Ligand binder design. Sequence first.
Ligand code: NA
Lengths: 118, 118, 116, 74, 74, 73
Amino acid sequence: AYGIGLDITELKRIASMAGRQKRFAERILTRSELDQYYELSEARKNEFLAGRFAAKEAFSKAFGTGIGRQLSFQDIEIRKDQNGKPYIICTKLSQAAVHVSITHTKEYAAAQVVIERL
Amino acid sequence: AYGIGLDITELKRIASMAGRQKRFAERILTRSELDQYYELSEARKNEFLAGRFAAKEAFSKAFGTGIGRQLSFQDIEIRKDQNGKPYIICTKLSQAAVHVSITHTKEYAAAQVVIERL
Amino acid sequence: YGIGLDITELKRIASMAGRQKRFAERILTRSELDQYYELSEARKNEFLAGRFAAKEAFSKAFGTGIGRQLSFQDIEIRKDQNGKPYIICTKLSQAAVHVSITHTKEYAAAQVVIER
Amino acid sequence: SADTLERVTKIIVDRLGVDEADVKLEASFKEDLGADXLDVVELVMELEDEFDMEISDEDAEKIATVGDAVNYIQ
Amino acid sequence: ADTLERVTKIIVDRLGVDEADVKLEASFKEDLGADXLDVVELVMELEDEFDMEISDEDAEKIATVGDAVNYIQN
Amino acid sequence: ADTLERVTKIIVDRLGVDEADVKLEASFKEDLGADXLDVVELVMELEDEFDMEISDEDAEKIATVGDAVNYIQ
Ligand code: NA
């Protein structure tokens, strides 16, 4: 559906995984996102993970269905272009344009998503 | 779009104010929003109040004038739809679509609004 | 057409001791400096964190970030009589811009939408 | 009155960042006294209480300065 | 029956919600204060504790504690 | 390089990291975790220390430490 989404996620909540962050990463990331994650340092893993969870929560908000039957975390992938600008490729999105922006503070990951008419 | 707006509100600040001033919520919320607020626990209350305040501040910015002479808190109402997502009905709007997204962390409530065509 | 969002911690921007002035010269245009000098201490840190957030949001929206393709000096934020901010940026019109800026005790945040 | 002014300065100082030697009739709340939106609505509520009155969001916008409030409290 | 004891412990240990507040009709999000991130850790907790896997499709299908129990027991 | 010695002292005070952390091939963003704000405060400190001018573009080129050392020479 056409909509917008906003999501702010506290870094500490993702960092507080320790022995659960691998399973959580696998539930949250696609194949290529996971490869990037395994290549990162531990502080960088939490940031990467919180940014992706925020971007995907925001996207599902704009998509208007939330995560579930119509949309799985695995159907959404954030990629970066040559300039490091993030974009979303989604397997369930039909004839529409998607916009995303991700930002970080020391304690937070925030993302906003716009799904528009082509 | 015709206008956009963003607002982040501190939950503790809202909590102290409502503690200090029992009519703060009556000023911010419509009667319908207000009845909804009353059905909630002490926790759920400050975040519901902070979220609606954020959504109204953001809307008033998207609307272009902020809250005041051209627009009251009372003219903006946040409603839940079929599945629960928030949307806005504003007495001063007639030929624009309005989009809102509301998010929450442990300390902050945040919302964004887009007012646009069709 | 793209969107940009940025959230900057206020402490870090006020925290710039004698280093904050040179920082303002880098982030602000001439018309924005004049305004910044004429301000109080607290209002100064806020004015600066918002301009930084706004310019970063706009730069993300534009798709390049700050650098070769776009400079802070190319972005100017002004406010009308209703206090609504708007961006001027003669870096290729053919597009309308929308901006919103907000402040909290800890943070300065901004969003931008650049459309077709 | 000149009474209403002392009751308004007390309320401002208590509420905002302001000292006591800055509540000069011309001082704008948002501009000069470091007030944001949540600060002024609280400020408005103090006044509604301290002078048994009702101040709409419309009237809130009229009282932009210290002198504005006073005049309004008459 | 036994499954509710374990399920409840999970809920209590995660969402930290009083206890004795874990009713079969109790909605995780609406009645227990769970955001989206809390419900995903909850589901993961359930996946370990019972050695099962819960898809995103299935995670949506289970709103209440009773829904959790029923899902688990069959 | 006393240049590096001077570059590291600046980095261990604007970013807070330890020391061995600051290697020559260390990335400002990935290994030191400096964001867009950290990066400009970092570039301004270098402007100060070594007395030079780093344009908005110049700064987007100094990817790691070694690069910054090279630009300073
Ligand atoms: Na940021």
